[PDB]
Write a protein that binds this DNA or RNA. Structure first.
Length: 76
DNA sequence: GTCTCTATTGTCCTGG
DNA sequence: CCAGGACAATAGAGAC
């Protein structure tokens, strides 16, 4: 089948925030949510971002362990 | 009912 | 070795 690629620090911080938006603005389109996420991301000071970089890190290590060999080969 | 596009950041792959 | 891309989450919008 098709194995997904790991979530980076931003994508991890994205899920959490997106929910808090999806629960507050249930009908706001996700494309616009992405726009606002990208902006809030630039607001969060660098220091605050560490926890997610570490979080995202283990996410990748586990990824290899679970999927011994998967080449990220996307193409058009 | 079924796909494809919409958008963000970060990260890996390819062509030149 | 750099630019340009695909793609991870997410559901709706639009074509068909």
């Amino acid at each position: 089948g098709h194995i997904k690629r790991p979530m980076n620090a931003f994508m991890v911080w994205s899920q959490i925030e997106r929910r808090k938006i999806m629960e507050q603005s249930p009908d706001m389109h996700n494309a616009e949510i992405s726009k606002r996420l990208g902006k809030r991301w630039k607001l969060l000071k660098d220091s605050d971002k560490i926890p997610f970089i570490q979080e995202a890190e283990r996410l990748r290590l586990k990824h290899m362990a679970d999927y011994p060999d998967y080449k990220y080969r996307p193409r058009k």
